[PDB]
């Protein structure tokens, strides 16, 4: 009947709550900017188990979720077998302007795994069966006209986050190790089809490519340049470009990658950031001596020198590719040889 908002837009709403007349609220799973998810019995559907993605009532978020589930609709009519790894929409509705959309229940999100791992990086067969999942559900989208842009560790879940506890005698540390590493892509707020209206900026900053930056377009090799960041992330713990403002981005990339090629300074309009064709910026800012003190070459970062780790990295490289046109595409990391390693089971998803 009587239903609160508070003045940033969520919904107000205490475990017990009930939506509709069928969705009851039993626990909370997380919340950003677009909203909350919260986990749900479906009363109309065996009282099983959803995700409830309950968005803010605001304009923009309203229609970023109408975008989400023309999407989500779009992908389960192309992929009648969820054989692409993307979350499954079961039900969207409108509850007092709050757009809500029902998702099979999945667990931790891989950031929210790691941050209670204390940012204890992913074991390299782990990292690897990752990738080939996200290159195969991204391949897929990409090679509908649609592209995400919005990869991020946070859009990636688990389908069953347990875990087993390991002593690591190197670390002297406690070690959590995820049982299944299944994974599922969400989160398609912002993906764009060939044809639609491309937004200038897209993309959370530390994932976000160059091309994106110097404002020379972008598609489908976006999220190819953001896969590369999560596995780096996956593989180490940490961000690969923790960055707040455009300029250290790039000084960033020049300092892990080497230069930016002179035909894309050529072809940018942000010459601000540019003299001569080369990056300008101020060494003695405290933006400035953290690039310094922290960002080394992508090679440096690698923990082993064992031919898997040897084809990560390389694998990671061709996906950080300055150049969107040269950027390895995800049919040709499909067939990298860095993936050589999975098994027989994770290469056919029976996992
Ligand atoms: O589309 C999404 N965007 C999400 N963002 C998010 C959700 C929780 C914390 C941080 C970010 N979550 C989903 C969907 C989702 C779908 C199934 C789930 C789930 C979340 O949590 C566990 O089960």
Same mark, same amino acid.
């Given at each position: 009947?009587?239903? &609160? ?10 475990? #017990? ?16 900017? @677009? ?17 409830? %993605? ?39 509705? =409108?509850?007092? #302007? ?5 998702? +099979?229940?999945?667990?931790? =999100?891989?950031?929210?795994? !790691? ?13 690897? /069966? ?7 559900? !991204?391949? @897929?989208?990409? &090679? =509908? ?8 560790? +946070? ?7 347990? *875990?087993?506890?390991? $002593? =690591? ?9 995820? %049982? ?15 044809? &639609? /209206? ?50 250290? /981005? ?19 309009? %942000?010459? %601000? $950031? @540019? ?37 990560? *990295? ?19 990391? !499909?067939?990298?040889? *860095? *993936? ?12």
């Amino acid at each position: 009947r009587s239903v &609160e908002d508070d003045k940033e837009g969520h919904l107000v709403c205490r475990i #017990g709550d009930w939506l509709q007349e069928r969705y009851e609220i039993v626990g909370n799973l997380g919340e950003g900017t @677009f909203g909350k998810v919260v986990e749900c019995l479906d009363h109309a559907r065996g009282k099983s188990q959803v995700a409830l %993605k309950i968005i803010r009532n605001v304009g923009k978020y309203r229609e970023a979720a109408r975008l989400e589930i023309n999407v989500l609709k779009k992908i389960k009519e192309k992929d009648k077998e969820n054989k692409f790894l993307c979350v499954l929409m079961s039900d969207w509705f =409108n509850f007092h #302007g709050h757009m809500c959309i029902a998702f +099979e229940l999945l667990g931790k =999100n891989t950031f929210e795994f !790691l941050k209670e791992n204390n940012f204890q990086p992913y074991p390299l067969p782990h990292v690897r /069966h990752m990738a080939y999942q996200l290159c195969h559900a !991204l391949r @897929f989208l990409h &090679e =509908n006209q649609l592209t995400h842009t919005d990869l991020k560790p +946070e859009n990636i879940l688990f389908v069953n986050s347990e *875990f087993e506890t390991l $002593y =690591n005698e190197h670390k002297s540390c406690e070690e959590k190790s995820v %049982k299944n590493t299944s994974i599922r892509v969400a989160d398609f707020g912002s993906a764009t089809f060939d044809h &639609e /209206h491309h937004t200038t900026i897209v993309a959370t900053r530390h994932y976000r490519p160059p091309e994106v930056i110097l404002e020379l377009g972008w598609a489908q090799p976006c999220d190819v340049w953001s896969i590369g960041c999560i596995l780096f992330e996956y593989y180490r713990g940490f961000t690969l470009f923790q960055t707040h403002e455009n300029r250290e /981005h790039l000084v960033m990339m020049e300092k892990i990658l080497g230069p930016i090629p002179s035909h894309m300074i050529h072809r940018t309009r %942000k010459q %601000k $950031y @540019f003299y001569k064709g080369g990056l300008v910026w101020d060494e003695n800012s405290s933006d400035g001596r953290y690039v310094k003190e922290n960002c080394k070459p992508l090679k440096s970062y690698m923990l082993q020198d064992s031919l898997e780790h040897v084809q990560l *990295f390389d694998l990671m490289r061709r996906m950080l590719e300055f150049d969107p046109a040269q950027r390895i595409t995800l049919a040709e990391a !499909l067939l990298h040889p *860095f *993936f050589a390693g999975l098994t027989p089971e994770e290469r056919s998803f029976h996992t």
